[PDB]
Design a protein around this ligand. Structure first.
Ligand SMILES: *[C@@H]1O[C@H](CO)[C@@H](O[C@@H]2O[C@H](CO)[C@@H](O[C@@H]3O[C@H](CO)[C@@H](O)[C@H](O)[C@@H]3O)[C@H](O)[C@H]2NC(C)=O)[C@H](O)[C@H]1NC(C)=O
Ligand SMILES: *[C@@H]1O[C@H](CO)[C@@H](O[C@@H]2O[C@H](CO)[C@@H](O[C@@H]3O[C@H](CO)[C@@H](O)[C@H](O)[C@@H]3O)[C@H](O)[C@H]2NC(C)=O)[C@H](O)[C@H]1NC(C)=O
Ligand SMILES: *[C@@H]1O[C@H](CO)[C@@H](O[C@@H]2O[C@H](CO)[C@@H](O[C@H]3O[C@H](CO)[C@@H](O)[C@H](O)[C@@H]3O)[C@H](O)[C@H]2NC(C)=O)[C@H](O)[C@H]1NC(C)=O
Ligand SMILES: *[C@@H]1O[C@H](CO)[C@@H](O)[C@H](O)[C@H]1NC(C)=O
Ligand SMILES: *[C@@H]1O[C@H](CO)[C@@H](O)[C@H](O)[C@H]1NC(C)=O
Lengths: 473, 115, 101
């Protein structure tokens, strides 16, 4: 039971309860403490430091504080403009640095002591490209929120010069709630293959908006580039048949994972969830899964270098460490089966560019796997199901639809009598009888209404437009 | 929507339900008629003074000199900015206000005057 | 002690100085553009490089002047995208079938 301490930085609320990340970090320490299968002869302690959000000098302070106490590795904070400072200190002082949020690596930064458990969006962009080309789209329409979304999808946006695609680009405004003006624009342009790029909270925030303008139908087909997609409240949508597709790096097939996530739910609702925003109560976000898997890879490294000790380096004592060079290589050569599955590191840049993805989609039941992906192979898909036609095709009674008509002498007539009557109960004729049989054989929930323009509808020579039913259709 | 403002040296012209947000799905006409040899000066009072960064459709207040859809287009105003005052001697400024299927705003207030 | 710091060029180096200066008050005057993280609240910097959120609009005006209906963008490294984001959004409204390499 040798003493060993890990640096924990966690940009946090600066109020209220603990963030998800820090809890998931402590969870790992406790679990490693109990199951002696890992580090039986060494007990790792842990120190945590809490900083303001986005204050690089402030982070550097606490990094110097922890390095004074001595650590093995610093689990970097989760927003870039502080990650850079912490990394630049860890590199220059020899202590390995492990990161969990994707940052924009500077073009030629010669750092060598950093690894990143978040999947590279080079690979993620490539996989999204493969998925798009699988659905055989041609008019896709990217949507992002932060400026960095470009850099994040650069592998996608260059693609039009190779494959046959035409893709617009739009940006969610600075305010999150008013997405209506963008949605209005998008609906007018007839954009029916949308790629969102926003942290899943923002995704839920715009999905309500999309509901209010009635996009949530069988036409539109969103692809969500984020990873924590299961946290969505699927329920108000899963019966409208839109075609949502996301990804899930979070391997949840192993029974071990099921148990760990469950006990996480036990200790996590311990902190209050959000009842209104539209997220599941008590589900473990990827940004906490990466915390958890960080400690395991660190331990798998540490258990094979017993000579390791904890020296008290000082920031003013710029002399590097006696164990950094070997320890860092040991980490970079690790393998493990964490909550995200396979764990490896590109030997060249210490990034992560090889993993295993479960593509998912919205079936009628809910989010359920429909294939796998990984950078080595292509995109393997197992949705080879076959459905013989139920006699009442398309419905028992679902997906209410409006129908549109016009008065014609034998076909459609307003019901003739004294008392005024409303709804699809004031009309009679032939076509109504045709529609009537349709409902009795397919289960329709139809509202009938007339065309204000009152024409058959035809091509308009002036502008290429139409009128009557054709225009509205 | 029709407020027949015929035969006034000046008078109030405004969007429906003006102090409230204008109702949706409204395509209502307005017509300003000037007696021969007169000049039309249209005064327009904006409710809210902000600078939009964009120009869009779905809610547009255009101005015509003559019968609608058949006279030359003067300009097609939208947003929340106050349009500049229009002085012409075409003697017929006929103005139409439209509405989309949602997304109402603060409306508008105007004042026609004849000389 | 110094009245003010005229800081370095490379963006990663610039961020740390910007943070230090704001935390202590001394004004910091920059010269190279960098995509300031829109989640940063600091106030003690001004940077003289003509911010690309306007240069891009100008480039778009220029391209539109030519009545170009096809244009190909070549950048150098990743940050060029951010540098041209106001151009790349053009095909949303206008008619610019552009490629990128
Ligand atoms: C380590 O990192 C390097 C750099 O990211 C990885 O190299 C990358 O490998 C992928 C897969 O081969 C390359 O994608 C290729 O793109 C071309 C585009 O025309 C396409 O035709 C190929 O089918 C493939 O998709 C990617 O370009 C390449 N990056 C470079 C060097 O530009 C490497 O795979 C990573 N892994 C390891 C363990 O080395
Ligand atoms: C600094 O302050 C100015 C306001 O004094 C901000 O100006 C805004 O800049 C944007 C462009 O970045 C403008 O949008 C553009 O408007 C012109 C004219 O309508 C149009 O031709 C362009 O296509 C584009 O739509 C916006 O109108 C302008 N004004 C507003 C509403 O504030 C400027 O953004 C500020 N600097 C930064 C980078 O924050
Ligand atoms: C939403 O998910 C749907 C999942 O089935 C998908 O439905 C169908 O997907 C196939 C893809 O090949 C389309 O292809 C059909 O039509 C072509 C052209 O006539 C034929 O060559 C094919 O053999 C096949 O019949 C179908 O059009 C499409 N529809 C169905 C139900 O068959 C939808 O495409 C997805 N997207 C949307 C917009 O909802
Ligand atoms: C596709 O995936 C299924 C399930 O993982 C697997 O059984 C099958 O062998 C895979 N096919 C390929 C291409 O490997
Ligand atoms: C559609 O069918 C499902 C399952 O029977 C039911 O739960 C839902 O309420 C129905 N909705 C409509 C549109 O009738």
């Amino acid at each position: 039971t040798h003493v060993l301490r890990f640096g924990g930085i966690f940009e946090y609320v600066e109020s209220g309860p603990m963030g998800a990340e820090e809890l998931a970090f402590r969870f790992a320490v406790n679990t490693i403490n109990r199951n002696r299968t890992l580090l039986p002869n060494t007990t790792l302690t842990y120190d945590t430091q809490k900083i303001n959000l986005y204050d690089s000098f402030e982070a550097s302070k606490k990094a110097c504080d922890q390095l004074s106490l001595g650590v093995a590795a610093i689990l970097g904070p989760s927003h870039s403009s502080s990650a850079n400072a912490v990394q630049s200190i860890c590199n220059a002082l020899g202590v390995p640095h492990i990161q969990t949020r994707w940052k924009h690596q500077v073009s030629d930064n010669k750092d060598s002591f950093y690894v990143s458990l978040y999947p590279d969006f080079s690979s993620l962009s490539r996989a999204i490209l493969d998925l798009v080309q699988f659905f055989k789209w041609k008019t896709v329409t990217v949507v992002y929120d932060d400026s960095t979304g470009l850099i994040r999808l650069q592998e996608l946006i260059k693609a039009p010069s190779r494959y046959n695609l035409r893709l617009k680009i739009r940006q969610l405004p600075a305010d999150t709630k008013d997405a209506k003006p963008l949605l209005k624009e998008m609906k007018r342009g007839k954009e029916f293959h949308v790629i969102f790029d926003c942290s899943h909270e923002m995704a839920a925030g715009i999905l309500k908006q999309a509901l209010a303008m009635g996009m949530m139908t069988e036409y539109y087909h969103y692809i969500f580039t984020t990873l924590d997609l299961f946290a969505l409240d699927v329920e108000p949508y899963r019966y409208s048949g839109v075609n949502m597709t996301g990804f899930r790096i979070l391997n949840t097939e192993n029974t071990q994972v099921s148990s760990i996530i469950e006990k996480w739910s036990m200790e996590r609702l311990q902190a209050p969830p959000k009842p209104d925003s539209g997220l599941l109560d008590g589900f473990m976000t990827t940004d906490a899964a990466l915390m958890y898997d960080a400690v395991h890879v660190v331990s798998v490294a540490v258990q094979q270098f017993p000579q390791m000790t904890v020296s008290s380096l000082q920031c003013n004592r710029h002399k590097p460490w006696r164990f950094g060079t070997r320890f860092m290589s040991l980490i970079k050569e690790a393998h493990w089966e964490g909550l995200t599955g396979r764990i490896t590191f590109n030997k060249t840049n210490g990034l992560r560019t090889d993993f295993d993805l479960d593509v998912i989609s919205l079936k009628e039941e809910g989010l359920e796997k429909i294939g796998t992906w990984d950078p080595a192979s292509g995109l393997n898909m197992t949705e080879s199901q076959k459905g013989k036609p139920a006699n009442i095709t398309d419905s028992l009674s679902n997906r209410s639809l409006i129908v549109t008509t016009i008065l014609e002498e034998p076909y459609v007539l307003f019901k003739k009598s004294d008392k005024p009557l409303y709804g699809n109960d004031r009309f009679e004729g032939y076509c109504i009888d045709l529609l009537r049989e349709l409902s009795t054989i397919l289960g329709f929930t139809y509202e009938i209404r007339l065309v204000e323009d009152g024409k058959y509808g035809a091509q308009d020579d002036v502008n290429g437009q139409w009128n009557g039913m054709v225009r509205e259709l | 929507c029709g407020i027949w403002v015929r035969t006034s040296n000046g008078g109030h012209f405004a969007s429906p339900n003006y102090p409230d947000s204008y109702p949706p799905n409204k395509e209502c006409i307005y017509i300003l008629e000037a007696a021969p040899r007169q000049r039309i000066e249209l005064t327009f009072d904006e409710r809210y003074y902000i600078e939009p960064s964009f120009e869009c459709r779905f809610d547009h207040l255009e101005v015509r000199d003559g019968p609608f859809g058949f006279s030359p287009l003067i300009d097609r105003y939208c947003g929340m900015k106050s349009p500049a005052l229009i002085r012409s001697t075409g003697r017929f400024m006929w103005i139409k206000f439209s509405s989309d299927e949602e997304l109402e705003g603060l409306g508008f207030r105007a004042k026609y005057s004849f000389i």
